[PDB]
Design an enzyme around this catalytic site. Structure first.
Site, PDB file in Angstrom:
ATOM      1  N   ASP A  78       0.915 -46.728  38.577  1.00  0.00           N
ATOM      2  CA  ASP A  78       0.366 -45.762  37.626  1.00  0.00           C
ATOM      3  C   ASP A  78       1.174 -45.702  36.324  1.00  0.00           C
ATOM      4  O   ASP A  78       0.622 -45.458  35.251  1.00  0.00           O
ATOM      5  CB  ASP A  78       0.344 -44.354  38.248  1.00  0.00           C
ATOM      6  CG  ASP A  78      -0.810 -44.146  39.232  1.00  0.00           C
ATOM      7  OD1 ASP A  78      -1.470 -45.136  39.624  1.00  0.00           O
ATOM      8  OD2 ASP A  78      -1.045 -42.975  39.623  1.00  0.00           O
ATOM      9  N   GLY A 125       5.670 -43.898  47.894  1.00  0.00           N
ATOM     10  CA  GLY A 125       5.112 -42.901  48.797  1.00  0.00           C
ATOM     11  C   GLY A 125       3.845 -43.289  49.547  1.00  0.00           C
ATOM     12  O   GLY A 125       3.349 -42.516  50.372  1.00  0.00           O
ATOM     13  N   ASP A 133      -7.589 -48.723  42.370  1.00  0.00           N
ATOM     14  CA  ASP A 133      -7.146 -48.220  41.065  1.00  0.00           C
ATOM     15  C   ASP A 133      -5.990 -49.052  40.510  1.00  0.00           C
ATOM     16  O   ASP A 133      -5.892 -49.280  39.296  1.00  0.00           O
ATOM     17  CB  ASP A 133      -6.676 -46.760  41.161  1.00  0.00           C
ATOM     18  CG  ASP A 133      -7.616 -45.878  41.976  1.00  0.00           C
ATOM     19  OD1 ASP A 133      -8.043 -44.822  41.450  1.00  0.00           O
ATOM     20  OD2 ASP A 133      -7.906 -46.222  43.140  1.00  0.00           O
ATOM     21  N   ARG A 203     -15.121 -44.037  40.930  1.00  0.00           N
ATOM     22  CA  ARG A 203     -14.114 -44.404  39.939  1.00  0.00           C
ATOM     23  C   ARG A 203     -13.236 -45.592  40.322  1.00  0.00           C
ATOM     24  O   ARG A 203     -12.947 -46.448  39.479  1.00  0.00           O
ATOM     25  CB  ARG A 203     -13.221 -43.208  39.586  1.00  0.00           C
ATOM     26  CG  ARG A 203     -12.130 -43.566  38.578  1.00  0.00           C
ATOM     27  CD  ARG A 203     -11.616 -42.348  37.819  1.00  0.00           C
ATOM     28  NE  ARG A 203     -10.724 -41.506  38.612  1.00  0.00           N
ATOM     29  CZ  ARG A 203     -10.850 -40.185  38.720  1.00  0.00           C
ATOM     30  NH1 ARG A 203     -11.836 -39.556  38.097  1.00  0.00           N
ATOM     31  NH2 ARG A 203      -9.974 -39.486  39.432  1.00  0.00           N
ATOM     32  N   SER A 204     -12.810 -45.655  41.581  1.00  0.00           N
ATOM     33  CA  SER A 204     -11.948 -46.758  42.003  1.00  0.00           C
ATOM     34  C   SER A 204     -12.620 -48.106  41.781  1.00  0.00           C
ATOM     35  O   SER A 204     -11.984 -49.048  41.304  1.00  0.00           O
ATOM     36  CB  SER A 204     -11.542 -46.606  43.469  1.00  0.00           C
ATOM     37  OG  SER A 204     -12.667 -46.619  44.328  1.00  0.00           O
ATOM     38  N   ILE A 205     -13.906 -48.196  42.125  1.00  0.00           N
ATOM     39  CA  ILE A 205     -14.654 -49.438  41.938  1.00  0.00           C
ATOM     40  C   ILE A 205     -14.820 -49.681  40.443  1.00  0.00           C
ATOM     41  O   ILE A 205     -14.829 -50.829  39.988  1.00  0.00           O
ATOM     42  CB  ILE A 205     -16.041 -49.369  42.629  1.00  0.00           C
ATOM     43  CG1 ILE A 205     -15.842 -49.256  44.150  1.00  0.00           C
ATOM     44  CG2 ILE A 205     -16.865 -50.611  42.282  1.00  0.00           C
ATOM     45  CD1 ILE A 205     -17.114 -49.005  44.948  1.00  0.00           C
TER      46      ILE A 205
END
EC number: 3.2.1.172
Length: 363
Positions: A78, A125, A133, A203-205
């Site tokens: 991220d 984590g 993502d 969203r991930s796709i």
């Protein structure tokens, strides 16, 4: 009615809502601001309006000091995404601070933990877990850097990461990809046989297809993946479009279950599909016939998910808030927010790729 008009409206609304010190998460280097600013910078390229560039630069300069030093979450893919804004900032200013900060993020790949085949853990984590993502968080940046510093090893890196995600998360039946995969099969959402999470979360796709659509052109000419990624995108888009809502032209939080009353049409994923489709058509990866699907989505998005407040603010509603890997009930229960940064960035980016097609329609 033109795509850029809405892009500017939303951009100005957000920039008026937050100073760079407030852009959430406030005073933190993260992909929420990263994607919104990638959109703002894409808008600057399109309109030539300096205020867009300046705002993005101000955020970068808030977090990167005189010596290129940057504080960020050192174990997260991220953290790498925002680095995408460093390339256009450097190209325009030639200020080495941005290259120095980019190198800090690029150096993360060698420090992150991986699955047995080499796939990056999404975070320290999330041991042995690959989330779709992550392809967008770490893929595009790697290729931009590879081309800037001629480091071909990064091409092999992204090729591996994408091949692993596709191998483990792609559903042969629908053509859709599951949100996440746990090689250790320890998470409650991990299928005991495949290790995959149970649902197709929009969203991930969307991040996956945006990535493929943007990364093909960064590869060397003749690179093997120019064909592999083009074919993968074509198949994913075909799969995704089969689930477009006939009535609104949009897509559901959980892509393949639009008939369930607790499901709902989600904005960020829909915008990401719009971007990938428009981008694919513009570059020639997808048949121009997808233009109708794209325009239907555009109409529904504006008609069903946007509005201007009594105060003149442009609002894009129903953007799913930050969400992790999980179960169906978890996904549909996610808070639906207005003008969340990742969704705002997706919206703006989509408008910039749509503009060209919107203007040449019918010709």
């Amino acid at each position: 009615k033109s795509p850029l008009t809405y892009a500017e409206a939303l951009a100005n609304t957000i920039m008026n809502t937050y100073t760079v010190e407030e852009l959430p998460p406030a005073n933190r280097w993260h992909y929420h601001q990263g994607v919104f600013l990638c959109g703002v910078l894409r808008l600057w390229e399109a309109t030539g309006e300096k205020r867009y560039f300046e705002y993005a630069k101000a955020y970068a300069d808030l977090l990167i000091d005189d010596n290129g030093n940057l504080l960020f979450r050192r174990d997260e893919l991220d953290a790498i995404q925002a680095g995408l804004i460093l390339f256009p900032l450097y190209e325009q200013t030639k200020d080495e601070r941005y290259v120095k900060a980019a190198k800090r993020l690029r150096s993360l790949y060698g420090t992150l933990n991986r699955t047995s085949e080499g796939g990056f853990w999404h975070k320290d984590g999330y041991p042995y877990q690959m989330w779709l993502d992550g392809l967008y968080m770490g893929g595009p940046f790697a290729l931009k850097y590879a081309n800037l510093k001629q480091e071909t090893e990064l091409f092999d890196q992204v090729v591996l990461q994408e091949s692993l995600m596709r191998k483990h998360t792609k559903d042969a039946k629908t053509g859709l990809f599951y949100h996440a995969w746990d090689e250790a099969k320890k998470m409650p959402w991990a299928n005991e046989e495949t290790g995959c999470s149970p649902e197709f979360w929009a969203r991930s796709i969307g991040w996956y297809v945006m990535s493929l659509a943007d990364m093909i052109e960064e590869l060397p000419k003749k690179h093997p993946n120019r064909h592999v990624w083009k074919n993968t995108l074509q198949d994913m888009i075909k799969s995704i479009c089969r689930y477009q809502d006939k009535e609104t032209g949009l897509w559901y939080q959980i892509v393949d279950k639009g008939d369930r009353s607790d499901n709902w049409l989600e904005s960020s994923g829909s915008c990401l599909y719009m971007y990938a489709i428009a981008k694919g058509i513009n570059k020639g990866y997808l048949d121009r016939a997808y233009e109708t699907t794209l325009l239907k989505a555009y109409q529904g998005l504006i008609q069903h998910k946007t509005e201007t407040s009594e105060d003149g603010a442009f609002l894009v509603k129903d953007i799913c808030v930050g969400t992790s890997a999980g179960f169906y009930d978890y996904y549909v229960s996610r808070e639906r927010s207005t003008n969340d940064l990742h969704g705002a960035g997706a919206f703006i980016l989509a408008m910039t790729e749509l503009e060209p097609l919107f203007r040449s329609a019918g010709k």
